[PDB]
Symmetry: D6
Subunit: 154 residues, 12 copies
């Protein structure tokens, strides 16, 4: 019945750790997706653990494919463009494309969107891999369509 801890918290201490940044960014990404397309997008994965559709996004931006449509940049002074030169790679590639990290990339055809949101920690720049969809059935179309898109490339 008695409680050792009787400290009265200030309301600011009830704030979550970092949810303000994530919230403002998610709100503005959804808002801008609507600004361009007029649709109500929604978050579906916070730190996406799946790589196949993300490597597919990378390939589609590199090849200058039609519908992988850059929407906006997350942070202004982080990288706006990037290259694909890996010194380890046996045969180098020199494609200079727009940045995957720090950019919002929407497939409006498949009603889906992707985000690679930077954040600073441990003396390095790290990436939140977020996934967006205006409605469930379109997301369900994209996830179904991932393996077909691979089969054509294969």
């Amino acid at each position: 019945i008695p409680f050792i801890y009787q400290y009265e918290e200030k309301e600011n201490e009830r704030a979550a750790a970092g949810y303000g940044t994530f919230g403002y960014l998610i709100t503005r990404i959804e808002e801008t997706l609507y600004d361009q397309y007029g649709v109500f997008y929604e978050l579906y994965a916070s730190d996406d653990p799946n790589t196949e559709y993300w490597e597919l996004l990378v390939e589609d931006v590199r090849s200058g494919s039609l519908e992988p449509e850059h929407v906006a940049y997350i942070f202004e002074k982080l990288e706006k463009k990037t290259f694909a030169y890996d010194e380890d790679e046996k045969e180098p590639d020199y494609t200079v494309h727009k940045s995957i990290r720090n950019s919002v990339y929407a497939y409006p055809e498949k009603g889906v969107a992707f985000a690679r949101i930077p954040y600073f920690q441990d003396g390095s720049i790290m990436s939140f891999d977020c996934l967006f969809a205006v409605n469930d059935e379109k997301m369900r179309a994209f996830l179904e369509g991932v393996r077909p898109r691979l089969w054509e490339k294969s």
Copy 2:
């Protein structure tokens, strides 16, 4: 009278427990919300649950549209609200889309138990506390006793 080197009297602002502000806010609000929906008082039985089996079963039931799981509420407004089962690691393919487990307050009402995967940002990466709630101890004991046969049912 033996003396003390550290003669500074620490302040009340400096007695604040690290992390308990947000955790207490969220647990109290989950308690209040569960009371508003199911007119009963739930209380914490686990803070971060090392066990996974019944947690797995909650996910499996929400995936298979099972009746007993019920989605009480969402924890964070701008965080995830749905999720998918697609695991590229697994050879077997499933593409089912359901509501989220993380950021979701759930309740088995007949069984008298409640589940929550409270998200939190630590070192950037998103992690979750698996919190388990119950009304009375007999309800929780019945749930734990029935969890292990449900595995037989699935298998």
Copy 3:
């Protein structure tokens, strides 16, 4: 002769980190023990690495023994009760008892008190194992009794 560093101390910046939380809890534990048991309890192990008599406490709370007495809860909105179910157990235990973490237990006859103080750091919630006692010889009697109690119960 001279010194390179020449910055004053407001003494606001002279305060130790973590002692404020530890001091409030330790003092309120000692106070709460006085209100219930009118005698003075003192810290003897801040983070007791000895797991044997802590194991014995948990089994006594499982068994329903009246020897351990639940004096108070440490945090209001942390676990007030727990269970002994673990997947890995070949023979499962379903006993639901009061929590060990977030609780203070005092053996009144032996003059010894246990406090498993929760703390949120990094990955999860973790627990300080603090051990209190009224006088030195009661502590000695408890420790010598530990190992007999260990092999009597088995």
Copy 4:
């Protein structure tokens, strides 16, 4: 559907952690190059994992080349010169050149700029390798020239 969390995000609490310094530094780098070269460079790499063209940069500055031009120093009281003494190296090179870390170097004809931004983390001093460029074709030519320049260096 209501939400469990209801706290009000403040405008000071909406800030990103550590971006204000990285952005400030990057902005001041881009402002410095324009005040000296009349053209707009942009960030094409933040923390650069690639090493080969960075080692060609340090080789150029060590070798008294005029190809990289020192533009500015990032921090005033950090290292402003350096040397190349490794005890494990059997034959020591004692060359004293200008700093690579804490310095911004530029290849004006190639259109590519280099920056090694220092920072303090868990004690030790580390560095972000930043890479700048006027335009994409400037970058593609630089990347295409890295391995050829290495072939000449080995010849």
Copy 5:
């Protein structure tokens, strides 16, 4: 005349060195208090002593009730003021309950040496700066000379 990217002149509050404020407040008062007990000015000779032998011998002496290690003070009030030496893993335990090594200032007044295992909190757990004090260099060396003589004398 080379430009500088970083142009931010800091207020005085943020040139502060983290941790030195607590350490300095502690060291000053340890030296101050060690004057009132033994009337001698004291000085730091090891800030985080990495050697273990003579610190281990301090525990044996306090465990034995030896008259020479004398308890100057406790560092933090609400931390441990006593401790014990039971080891579950040790095949034959020792149940001695003495005064806490951590959180205490102990001084060998004749040898002109003082020991301080200062507590501090890092990553949750409680950790201890082992700080070594002395009055002058010749006494310190004399004590340092005495470690191995004092070490195997006890074995007898």
Copy 6:
């Protein structure tokens, strides 16, 4: 074309972590070296990975040589003296000298100043190995003289 994050960052957010102490300390170490030696000194390594000439310093202070000279102590209440005992070594060294950490040591003839700045990561007492010099040829002459000095120590 547009930007998602649009916080009007306040000027305080432009500060860099750890620089305030480094800038103040490096500036004052420089000021001190001019006052007692009449020459301007500058940083050549902020955290020196090298160990050989740093080890030579401690033997010069341990042997009371003219070669080093104790300019000042960096922190008031940290070690102003130290000792060289190591339990693991069979043959002991009981020499008590002055502190390497918390001290500024200058070779006034060679124009090279050493500083081992202590810092608290809160976790422990760690040290930055800074190296100062007046000019590049004085530095080059020191780096070359290290190994002949080491060969003389061998005899």
Copy 7:
């Protein structure tokens, strides 16, 4: 016709695989022993079973004196013929002496299956193969189906 460096030609002994002789002798003799006891042909299906569930079912059945499993024979003469279930770690001290699992062949003649945990010497400590047998796969499929219902009643 191109050359080959290895013109050496193998003794017929070197054709022999390492370890198969002992494993084959045992499998042959275990089969023959199952053939003489139950008059039917029993054959191998698992050579080192990675599945623990139906093997720990076997242990408890033997421990509980259950009539369901029968003990066909012993692998080795001077190895263990009996055993106990005492685990110092367990707070529940079990003092039951039953026939050994290792060095023993067990069989459920009802279900048309046979169990053999064959002991082998390697690197000092004794280790064991867990080999599974069955008359025909039609019999085995029912047993594999039957594992989960039996594991259920214990739950």
Copy 8:
């Protein structure tokens, strides 16, 4: 001019380690494939570190596909059939299939043969992954056809 070690050794210690076992098995598999299909086969991969086309053979024999054909069993007293029950997967997969290990399987029209040869070492029984083919032309098509079926199956 001189040499320290002057020991003369004839053909008897010129033996390589383990090749005698590998040679006898490889020679007989090739010969047995010749008697069944009339076409000389040859080894192209010894211990195939790749996994995905070997999963195909696993699924084919289990799924009762007539793509594989059982050429022979390698060892007489090792397993001739196996099963797929595993604790991790909630799916029981009680399917009783012919053994992948200890069996030589060949896709005769595709000209590619498989063999998971077994060996006893480290106590545990382990398996080589030898891959046989007749001509380099068919082999190239097989590798290029392996990536389709992974995307086709899903």
Copy 9:
């Protein structure tokens, strides 16, 4: 048919280590019969349990007449030993009979112990074997371990 068609000679049928193990176990059983008149049999071949093995070394160290020293396994290996553990602050100078390379027996309890030395790796390790007259003598002995552990503790 079967790829492998080499017929084993009988020498290849043998098992590594069992020949020595069987010889030693047989002769231990023979030696115990010809001293105590009762047939002993193996109940554990490499006992992982340690509680009653520790009690045996102390009974031998205490000069206790409870355990009876029956035989030595290897002629020229150790026949005496000491417990000097430099790690401990208390050096023990007690010279007791060797646990390793010896066969002990509790005739009343009907249980025997053997620490059989084997030369493998570099160092010398040991098999710890348990023997017993019958099942009930074993069960009674096994249950007496926890009582005797309580006495030595107090």
Copy 10:
């Protein structure tokens, strides 16, 4: 002064282990190159730890280059062909080329020969990297042209 070990090591026991096989293969390889190139080749690396000139060889055979010439196969029943497929690699390659393992290759103008001698250890199949050269100048010339060759493909 005496000697404890009075056993004169027996003649059969004096030979070393592995040199008989290694000596056979090197002697046969050297002889093989003498007929094929009319010059004496000699060993310069017995277990070559270097990777750069070995990774260039496999690319040379892969590319169909005319510089490297196949001399002989080491073991008859091991691989005589292989493929460069790595399912891990994002850049797929399905080339079927001659085997580097089990083969002796030579750069006859450059005066350097390579041999990847296969051996069986602890189950898996492994390789000895052996390098031959006609004279030191040839070796110094090959070594000085390795790194320029590496930057040529990029």
Copy 11:
């Protein structure tokens, strides 16, 4: 019983015990012939280090205390040195080899032998300890720690 192969007497041989038995028998035989008393094994691979260090230092300091009895292997090292590159203060004393040698403290009734063996090629050493009677062994172990204290002074 499943396994019915009857092992030959040669098959019953225990690996390693032949060499260990030969070496132990010869060491004890030499000890008897030189000092007239029967020595016997008290440690076969002594995990302890202190008194072994005492032997090494007694030979390094050329004390007349330990007597060199024998060399175990003819072609292995008969001499050795104490240079350790990692030790800052280097001792260049060249003493006789501890490994490959049998040394005895004849009054103290104790013998030491560091027998070399080759495993994975690399040469390692079995430390073996011998004594005439248990009481002499007790006395030696008793004096071990005071010997360290004396070296400390």
Copy 12:
């Protein structure tokens, strides 16, 4: 009092494994050194854990220094020459010299000989670093001069 082990070893069974080849190599190296320098060399380090003077041997051989003199080669078909190429080192040496491994060298004035005997174990070529000398005083002088040489070269 009894002994369980009742098998009497034969003389072949007494063999210390490895001492035969090691003894042949040491005896032959000693004899060759006697024949070349008319003096008697003797082993002073069996498996030298020290690296400094061996690195100095490598330096002197690389620079053709007159002080080390090649005495013999250990194995006939092993490498007689070697190179000093390391990809890991940014600036590389291409020098081709006589092999340190498989060779016996000797500093004839210092009275100290070096040998690096190769051996084949578990699929790897490894090296016993053996040190030889005529008298202890010359060995002492060499060890004393080690560090001087070390910073003489630098």
